[model samples]
Target: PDANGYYYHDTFEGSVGQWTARGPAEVLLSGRTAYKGSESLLVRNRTAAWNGAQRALNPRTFVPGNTYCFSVVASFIEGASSTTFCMKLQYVDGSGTQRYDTIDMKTVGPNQWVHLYNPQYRIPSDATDMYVYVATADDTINFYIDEAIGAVAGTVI
Candidate 1:
C-alpha cells in the first residue's frame, strides 16, 4: 500500500482488531506463525467447509461501483498436506438477494505461506452488508492468516 493506493490492513501484530469467526470457527490472534508480523490470526474448530474468519466492510469505505484490491497471506498449521483456500466477498443486493464472489484462491500447505490476491475487484452497485472471509475446503483443518489488506487497485503487496 502507498499514498494513493491504501485502504485497510490487519497485521495481527497488535491484536485481532475487527476480525471475527465467520461461522462455527474459532479465530484468535496468536504467536504460532506469521507471514510478516510477530503474530497472526488463527482459524480453527470449523464443522463446515466454509466456516472461517470474516470481517465486516463498511459501506462508506467500500464504495459501490468502484474497484479495490484484496490480499491475504495464509498457511496451514496441521492436518492435510495441501488444500485449497479462498478469499471471498459476500453481500446482499438491493433486491434482497445474497451473493458470493471469489476474490482469489490458492493451494496452501503446512509450514508454507501463500498469497491470495485480487488486484481489481469491482463492488456491485446495489450491494449491501458486505463481508470478506477466508476459507478452505477442509473444515477440520486449522490455519493462520496474516497481512490481510484491502487497498486501491493496482497496488502490489
Candidate 2:
C-alpha cells in the first residue's frame, strides 16, 4: 500500500471475515479492546475447552514437510486472574487420517497481552486441509486476539 499502515495486511483493523468460530463459540471484530490497532477479534460464547476462533490454510500453499512462522496476540478481561490457551492446528493427512497439533501454549494474565508464537512449525509430510485455531486448553473463558500472522519462514527477510 502507498501508506505505511496498509503494509501490514495481517492486522485486524478492518475486516474479520477470514475468521470463524471453531465450534461451541462465536467470533466478531470488537473495538472494546486491542493489542495494537483500534479493534481486535473477540472470541466468545465458548461452551467447551476446545472452542474458539480459527482460520483456514489450504493444502497447496502450506506445503507439507515445510516449516512456517505463526504469531498471535491474545488477552482476556474476565474476572479470572489467568487462563491457559493454545494455538492449535487441525489437519488431514494424505493417508486419510485427521490430526490435531498444538503449536504453542501458555498461561496468560487477565488483561495482559501474550504472544502465542512458533517460529518453526513443520507441517507433517502428508498434511492437508489445514486449519489454525486458538482456544483454551481447559478453561472456557472468552478471549480477544489481534495482529495474527502466519507465513512461510523468514517472511520479513
Candidate 3:
C-alpha cells in the first residue's frame, strides 16, 4: 500500500510472485511484470509466500473520501477440475465509522490472462480508508491482481 495503505499483485515478467509497495516506498518482490514507475518491486513467489490479506491498511486503517479500484490478469484451470476465483474492492464509510460494501468478482480460466476490475466503491460518511484486493474462494486455484488505484478526495467520488 501507498501512504494511505493499499496493495497490488501481478504476474512477474521473469517469474511469479506478489509484488507489494508497503511498509516502505518500494516493491515487495511478488510481481510477474516489470516494476515500472519506481513503484512496486519484483521477486519470485517461491522466494516469497502469499499472504491472505484484506483492506488497505496492514493493521487495518481507514481513510475518508477515498475511492479504490482493483484489476487483474489471470489464467484458470483447463477442465472441470477448475474452481471459481474471487476478488474484491472494500472500504469503510466516510464518517470513519461504518462497514459499507465490498464489490466481488468471480471468474475462471486455464492458461490465459484475464483482467478483472472492482466496481466503484464509495466510502460512507463515517468511513476512513479504502482498499482493492484479489483472492481465491477455493485455495487450490491460482489468480493474479494486476493493479490498484485510489485517491483520497474531498469532492470527487
Candidate 4:
C-alpha cells in the first residue's frame, strides 16, 4: 500500500465475479451480507470506516491547481440512500500552509450503477498533496472507486 505518485486502485469485484471490491453476489443481488469469494470482506455498509479511512482516501498531498481526473461506477443495495461521493485534493503551501480542494459527485440509485468524472486542474507552485473522497450516505451503501488521476503538489509526500 505504498502511496507513491502512481495510479492506485482496487475492485470490489472479486477475481471470478463482477461485484465490487470484496463484494459478494448474494449481498449485491440481495440486501443480506453474504460472505462470498476469496477473502470474503463483503459486508453491508461499504463505508470509509471499514476501509481504514477516518475521512476519505487521503492522497496526503497535492500540487495546487494541478490537472486531475476521477470517475466511479457504483451500485447500491435497494435499501441504500442517494448521496454524493468526493475525490479531494489536500495540499500545503511554501510557508508550511495547508488547504484542500475537492471534486464531488454522486450515485443516483440504491442498487443501480452510476458513473461520474472530474475535470483536471493545475497544481499551485506551493501545493502539497492529493487523494480521493468517498462520502457518507444515509444507509448501508455499496460503491466502487473505478479510476482517479492527478498530479502531486510539490510539497506532498
Candidate 5:
C-alpha cells in the first residue's frame, strides 16, 4: 500500500475499473495466471499493432519537475512474433503539442514473468493531463500483466 502522497496501484484482484482496455485486451480472473495475486490483464493482439490497457492518471499526479516511477509485472504466453511490452506517458506539452513518451520496458518471452521498473521520467513543465499505459504489441500474441503501480517521488511502490 502507498503510505505517501496520491498514487496509482492495481493488483487486478476484483475490479477492473482502474483500467480501460484498448484493442483486444481482457481483464481476467478465473483460470488466468497472475504474477502475485488472483487476477491479471490478458492482452491479445491480432495483427501488427498495439493491444493492451491504459488508465488516466489523476490530474494532480504529475507536478512540474517531479519524477514518478512506473512498474509492472508482465509475461508473454504465446505469439507468432516477439513484441515489446511498453509503458507510456501520454500528455500534452506546454506548447499544446500532443506527445507520447513511450518506453519499451522489456520484451517478454514465453512462459516467463518479468518485472519492469522505470524511474527516469521527470514531469515536464506546463503539462496538462497525463495517462499511463501498459500493453504488448505484435502481429499476434498474448500477454499477462499484474501488480501495476506508479508512485510519486520515484518510489517503487
Candidate 6:
C-alpha cells in the first residue's frame, strides 16, 4: 500500500495463501526460478478452458469514479501453442447480473519476463463487488508470475 486508495501488493515471498487458483496454477518456491522474491506463481493451460490465479479486492478499495492500476510480471516456463495473460474485473451490474471486464490480453514471450500493466480503470457506479484476477489460457503452455501489484494510479510508489 503506497498512498491514496492503493492497497494491494504481493511478491510471493513466503506463501500464496492469499490467492485463489482457477485451474492448474500453483505456487512455486524452487530455487533459481523466480522473478522477484524467492517464489513465483506457476500456471499451466493444457486443454483446459482457463487457468491462473486471482485475489479479492476490498470493497472499500474502490469507489465510483476512482481510477486504479494493475500490473504483473510474468514469463513462460515452457512454450506451447499459445498463451495469454489477462487482468479481469468481476462485478455485478445494476441489473443484478454478473459481468466481467478484462484488459487487453497479453501473449507470453519465450523464456522472458514481461511486465503487463493496466494503467487505469475508473470504477463504474453500478459495480456491486469487484476483484482482480490474472489468468493464462492456451492449448498447452506453462508460465510463471511474480511481483504483482494493484493500486491507485497516482498512489503507486
- Pick the lDDT winner: 1
Writing each residue's lDDT as its tens digit, candidate 6 over 1-157 gives 5644546677777766467665555545443468886788776543454556667767676675577887777777665645677767777888999777885368765777777777677767788767677666544465677877777765443
For model 4, how many clashes?
27
- Give the alpha carbon lDDT tens digit for every residue of 32-134 in model 3: 4332322222211221122223335422333344454444444433432554444554455545553525454556655544545453544443544544444
- Backbone clash total for model 6 is 0
Return the lDDT, model 1, position 107: 87
Q: Assess every candidate by TM-score.
A: 0.94, 0.88, 0.45, 0.47, 0.81, 0.80
lDDT of 6: 0.67
**Best-matching candidate per TM-score:** 1
> lDDT of all the models against the reference?
0.88, 0.81, 0.39, 0.40, 0.68, 0.67
Q: lDDT value for candidate 2?
A: 0.81
Q: Which ten-residue region of model 6 has the weakest summed lDDT?
A: 23-32
How far off is model 4, as Cα RMSD?
A: 9.1
Q: What overall lDDT, based on C-alpha atoms, would model 1 receive against the true structure?
A: 0.88
Q: What is the per-residue lDDT of model 1 for residues 17-122, given as tens digits with 9 covering 90 to 100? A: 7899988789998897888868999998888878999989888888988899899999987888788998999899989998988989898667899999998999
| Per-residue accuracy of model 4 over 1-157 as CA lDDT, tens digit each | 2365444433323421222322122222332322222222223444442231112333344334445444444444454456544444445667887665555456475544455445454545666443344433344344433222333323131
**What lDDT does candidate 2 reach at residue 111?**
85
lDDT of 5 by residue, 27-129 (tens): 4543378887777777654343565677776665566567777778888767644667777777778898977777447875678888777755776666677
Candidate 6 regions with alpha-carbon error over 4 angstroms:
3-6, 23-32, 44-47, 79-82, 155-157
- Sorted by TM-score (best first), the order is 1, 2, 5, 6, 4, 3
Which regions of candidate 1 deviate over 4 angstroms? 1-4
Model 6 sits at a Cα RMSD from the real structure of 2.8
